[PDB]
Design a protein around this ligand. Structure first.
Ligand SMILES: OC[C@@H]1O[C@H](O)[C@@H](O)[C@H](O)[C@H]1O
Ligand SMILES: OC[C@@H]1O[C@H](O)[C@@H](O)[C@H](O)[C@H]1O
Ligand code: NA
Ligand code: NA
Lengths: 548, 548
């Protein structure tokens, strides 16, 4: 049904033995909780003092004054490295398990293996194979951080966002606040450090992806939750992150159920104050990222998660040092009363959107939808529906290079950035098909990058098969033709300014042009270009019009 | 840790294969839901019409006027047959997993196998072995209903209460409202019908044990609960029954998780109206029980569960036909406001008890506690802490026959009934240790039953090692000596009435007496009784004093 004999399908090893980390959850409680909470209190005091003295305060109106940096307007393309324990099984259904975004989520395997993907998991991995048994298999033996950064550079990308910490809480960086980190578990390396160092060497802006909430977190409680609870003073914190109905805010903690899904996480009293805030601060302080990509901010509203404090801190510590940016996923600004009204209730969506007030730019996922092209936005997606590696993904399931380039041009014409997801396997190897699409995009950008990087939308974004961008200064208009226009390029959209010159990017030759009497621009195409226009540029041909 | 090589420990068979019931939950939705809801609506209408026309109305004040039947005052001993799918694994910890009652619960295994007992389950049965894989192993090959009824008769019991439907919803009777029944799953017989027929044959009062709520139940919903839900219009209803925090009222339904926990259950729109009420009515109508033993009434308050309607119906359908009784487990009469106050908040216990207003008699579980001996009460317990079969139970864990008989006499002198739990294994065989205790109790009752059945508390319940009962007609006082009194029985407690005669039950000798000057009754005991009084009666010696 789900178990194939296809070599490409990751599956249970014949030598599988349970991963029992050196420290049980109770061991971490006894040995590390007090120490961590002590350290957290000191770090939170420092962060709060920085915010009290700093330009940015933890409130919507203060943070709103922060502006999108020039570099982020100009970047247009980022690489989103979706790699983590979920990369080992590398599975979602090719069809039929799409979320409301239209994507599919191999990167939700650690959660969905217990419900939506349980039949697959039980047949391919085994019911006795727990979430944390994927951690030792995340070897990174084929993961080369410099090669990933160079691939991103060569693709034309201007920022690189690793999945530094996703919903199950494994950190790509060596954290003092969790043993569920890349040094203790999986590759045995500070993967984030390697990527940060590579990004500095290649002059690449670096992101920090950070799940605000986690699916489960062991917490210290005064009173137990039921007569069945086996362990005094420990429970499991759960919020809305999982999306499915669950016990909230606390579930009863049972070692035989929970320990092998939360290996390495040190119990604390207050998930947000004692763990989330100090771990965020730690990564910002150590790695100095250019960009914060919150995720999982729907778990708890910001009145509880305190992400306005992490946002203010990030901006404050950047002052005078570098220009930085935050996405719009910190969480909701709504009051308890407004959150209740939404749950009770089109009318629910209007109230919800009113509470989405934090961040520098919008983050449509997979489907672009009805974007406001007057504000900055970024669409995230891979070359397929899949966020995270899908061993089944292939030529049939993935965009062609041609489709990817045309989609990219569309995005950029409409004021968007593309944050292009790449998804390695458990070894850290990138599938050849994803490598190929990056190479093809890179080859196209070699010719056409000046019509993409550092541009802005024009008064018109699309005309038939043409997409427009303009130089920052207004003096160059770029016409991206998604069909080879043949003998003649005709542009119907009025161009008020006089024209100094027109050229096809990829040719050093200046093109002929005249204005017809109906208003159209007519651009004859050299006979020598017709024989094989793909030699100049594949898929999309860009004409630069220099204005007076 | 948990898997022994003890043959007595039930464990995974080498020939185990998954039980995938011929009707999936979705099959039952498509094929049976409409039919069941059609029948339910008609049955609820009939039940409501009976209550409108009947003497008892579904409100606290009306139901309170119903009185404990003479037969229940007189019975003193019932047998509580704790048999179900949980009987197969037959496990709870010998120590350390007691609930707040002081008992332990092998009969919660179907629920606790996923949390508290998960380490045991994984080691002994396997992670791939689901709750419903116990159902085919509940063979009943050693279960003879006539033999169980005769065991009850011969023990001195006057009522027999089978676990007709416990918290996972397997019915001992052949129900039209569920395929999770004893005919379609497990023994392939209407076990309840067999027991009811035996009870009629042997003139035994018959109970109907009924879990109001169930741990999980598939329900039909207009809107799905999450973007992850695989099946339109089905979800899982959950209330407070499970005691541990859970999603309530609804969890997302996932076939690969839920189907092998809820085999046989037919989805309905309203758990209470479309399933609970008509299934209750069905069993009452078909089997004509003398007693309703509600359980699991803490799931939902009676405003939602509607158990005042089932209680009124039970009384109304019996009126003019037979005298019947209900325990006190229908559920809470508290308002939503009062239930909220209890959750917020010793103070919580006072409010909770104020909302416990339904039923004919109290049901202390395991621990008797501070019972009101002016009202009728019944303590339920097995010979050990274990409710349900525990394969580990032995001489060290169980009451001796001696202890059982003395506890029983204590209960009866204090106006209680003992509802003695007996716990068979998966085959339906009763463990030898429980058989031994029942033999001792039965042998004791053969001699002493007239001092137990049809008696009432006396003006004094206990004098040193002596417990008193009196015949309901006042003409006999029974003195139960828990120590052999030796050469003389001396009774300090004044007996105002003249004495016609005195006898030790088990002997035909009339005993002489004198009243001393201090007031004491002095009863010389025959020399021939002194060497071996245990021949006459074991453990407790009962003297019958006939009064004027
Ligand atoms: O594009 C980022 C995606 O964002 C979602 O919010 C997460 O829940 C997914 O796992 C991640 O892949
Ligand atoms: O006295 C009956 C016991 O009553 C409890 O309420 C149930 O939850 C137990 O399973 C059962 O053994
Ligand atoms: Na702003
Ligand atoms: Na009453």
């Amino acid at each position: 049904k789900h178990l194939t004999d296809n070599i490409l399908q990751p599956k249970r090893s014949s030598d599988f033995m349970a991963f029992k980390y050196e420290y049980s959850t109770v061991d971490l409680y006894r040995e590390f909780s007090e120490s961590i909470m002590d350290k957290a209190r000191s770090e939170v005091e420092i962060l709060e003092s920085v915010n009290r003295q700093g330009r940015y305060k933890p409130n919507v109106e203060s943070l709103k004054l922060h502006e999108v940096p020039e570099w982020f307007e100009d970047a247009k393309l980022g690489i989103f490295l979706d790699w983590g324990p979920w990369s080992v099984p590398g599975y979602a259904p090719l069809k039929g398990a799409e979320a409301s975004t239209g994507g599919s989520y191999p990167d939700w395997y650690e959660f969905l293996m217990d419900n939506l993907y349980k039949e697959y998991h039980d047949e391919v991995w085994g019911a006795d194979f727990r979430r944390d048994d994927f951690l030792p298999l995340l070897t990174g033996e084929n993961f080369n951080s410099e090669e990933y950064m160079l691939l991103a550079v060569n693709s034309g990308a201007k920022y690189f966002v690793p999945f530094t910490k996703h919903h199950a809480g494994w950190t790509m960086w060596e954290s003092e606040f969790t043993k569920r980190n890349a040094v203790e578990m999986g590759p045995g390396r500070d993967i984030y450090k390697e990527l940060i160092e590579a990004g500095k060497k290649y002059d690449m802006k670096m992101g920090f992806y950070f799940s605000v909430s986690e699916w489960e977190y062991p917490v210290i409680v005064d009173q137990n939750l039921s007569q069945w609870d086996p362990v005094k003073n420990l429970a499991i914190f759960q919020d809305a992150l999982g999306q499915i109905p669950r016990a909230t805010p606390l579930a009863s903690y049972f070692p035989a159920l929970h320990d092998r899904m939360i290996s390495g996480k040190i119990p604390v009293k207050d998930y947000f104050a004692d763990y989330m805030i100090p771990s965020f601060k730690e990564a910002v302080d150590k790695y100095d990222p250019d960009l914060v990509w919150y995720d999982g901010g729907w778990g708890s509203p910001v009145s509880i998660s305190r992400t306005m404090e992490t946002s203010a801190y990030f901006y404050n510590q950047a002052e005078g040092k570098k220009d930085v940016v935050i996405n719009n996923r910190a969480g909701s600004s709504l009051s308890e009363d407004d959150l209740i009204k939404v749950r009770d209730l089109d009318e629910a969506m209007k109230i919800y959107l009113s509470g989405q007030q934090l961040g520098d730019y919008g983050t449509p996922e997979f489907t672009i939808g009805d974007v406001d092209i007057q504000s900055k936005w970024e669409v995230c997606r891979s070359i397929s529906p899949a966020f995270g590696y899908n061993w089944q993904d292939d030529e049939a399931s993935s965009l062609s290079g041609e489709e990817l380039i045309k989609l990219f041009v569309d995005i950029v014409a409409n004021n968007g950035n593309l944050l292009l997801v790449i998804s390695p396997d458990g070894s850290g190897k990138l599938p050849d098909i994803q490598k190929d699409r990056l190479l093809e995009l890179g080859d196209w950008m070699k010719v056409n990058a000046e019509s993409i990087h550092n541009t802005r939308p024009w008064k018109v974004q699309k005309e038939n098969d043409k997409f427009f961008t303009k130089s920052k200064d207004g003096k160059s208009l770029f016409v991206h033709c998604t069909n080879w226009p043949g003998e003649n390029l005709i542009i119907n959209t009025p161009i008020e300014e006089g024209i100094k010159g027109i050229k096809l990017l990829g040719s050093d030759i200046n093109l002929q042009f005249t204005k017809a009497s109906n208003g159209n621009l007519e651009i004859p195409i050299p006979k020598d270009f017709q024989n094989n226009p793909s030699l100049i540029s594949k898929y999309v041909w860009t004409f630069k019009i220099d204005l007076n």
